[PDB]
Amino acid sequence: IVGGYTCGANTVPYQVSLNSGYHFCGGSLINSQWVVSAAHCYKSGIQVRLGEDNINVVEGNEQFISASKSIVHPSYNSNTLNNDIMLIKLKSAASLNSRVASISLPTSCASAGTQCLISGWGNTKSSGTSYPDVLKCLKAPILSDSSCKSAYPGQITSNMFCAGYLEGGKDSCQGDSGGPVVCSGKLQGIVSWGSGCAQKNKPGVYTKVCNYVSWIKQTIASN
Ligand SMILES: CN1CCC[C@@H](O/N=C/c2ccc(C(=N)N)cc2)C1
Numbered sequence: 001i002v003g004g005y006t007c008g009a010n011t012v013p014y015q016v017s018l019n020s021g022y023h024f025c026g027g028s029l030i031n032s033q034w035v036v037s038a039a040h041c042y043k044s045g046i047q048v049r050l051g052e053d054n055i056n057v058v059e060g061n062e063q064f065i066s067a068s069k070s071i072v073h074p075s076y077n078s079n080t081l082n083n084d085i086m087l088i089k090l091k092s093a094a095s096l097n098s099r100v101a102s103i104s105l106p107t108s109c110a111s112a113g114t115q116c117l118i119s120g121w122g123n124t125k126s127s128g129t130s131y132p133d134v135l136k137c138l139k140a141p142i143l144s145d146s147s148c149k150s151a152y153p154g155q156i157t158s159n160m161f162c163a164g165y166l167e168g169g170k171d172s173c174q175g176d177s178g179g180p181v182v183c184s185g186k187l188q189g190i191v192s193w194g195s196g197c198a199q200k201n202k203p204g205v206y207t208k209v210c211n212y213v214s215w216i217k218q219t220i221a222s223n
C-alpha cells in the first residue's frame with residue numbers, strides 16, 4: 001500500500017497473509033474454512049496466516065493453517081487477468097473471535113463513489129521498494145467505469161473495477177495482490193493489477209467480487 005496508514009493490529013480481522021516460506025499475497029477470510037484471493041496468487045504449498053499484524057513477529061493472535069485445496073476460477077485468463085479470483089480451503093476451520101473474523105460477500109455490486117478500505121503488506125513506495133512488516137490500510141473511492149476504461153484503454157472487462165486516486169500517490173501495490181477491498185462491510189474487490197503503483201492516471205484495478213458470489217457459494221457448497 002502506497003500513501004496509506006498503519007491499520008492497527010487486528011483491526012482488519014478478515015485480512016490473511018498467504019505464506020510459502022514468506023508472505024507473497026493477501027486474501028480475505030469469508031468463512032471458517034475458506035479464503036478468497038486472486039488467481040494470480042495461485043501456487044502450491046500455501047499456508048494461510050490469520051490474525052497477523054507484524055508478519056515477521058509472532059505477536060499472540062496468529063492462526064497458521066495449511067491450505068487443503070485451491071480452486072482458480074474456471075475462466076481465469078493470466079494474460080488479461082480476466083476473472084482474477086481464487087478460492088482456498090483451509091485444512092482445519094479457523095477459530096473465529098474479534099481479531100479473526102470472516103467478511104460478508106456482497107448481495108449487490110457497489111457504485112462509483114463508494115468509499116472502501118484496501119489493505120495489505122505490499123510495497124509502500126511508488127518508485128523504490130520498501131515492504132512494511134505491519135498491515136497497511138488505504139481508504140479509497142470506487143471510480144466510474146468510464147474513467148477506469150479511459151485510464152486503461154482496451155483492458156478493463158466487466159469483471160474489473162478501478163478504485164483510488166487519478167492524481168496518484170495513493171494505491172495498492174506489489175505484495176497487496178489478492179487482498180481485500182471492503183465497502184460498507186462487504187467484500188467488493190480483490191487487489192488484481194495496475195500500471196506501476198500510485199502513478200498519475202493509473203489507479204488500482206480490482207476483481208469485481210459481486211460477479212462471483214454465485215460461483216463462490218456453489219463452490220463452497222460442494223467442496
Ligand atoms: C509482485 N508481483 C508478483 C505477482 C504479479 C505482480 O502483481 N502485481 C500486483 C499489483 C500491481 C499494481 C497494483 C496497483 N497499482 N494497484 C496492484 C497489484 C507482481
Ligand SMILES: [Ca+2]
Pocket residue numbers: 052053054055056057058059062
Ligand atoms: Ca505476526
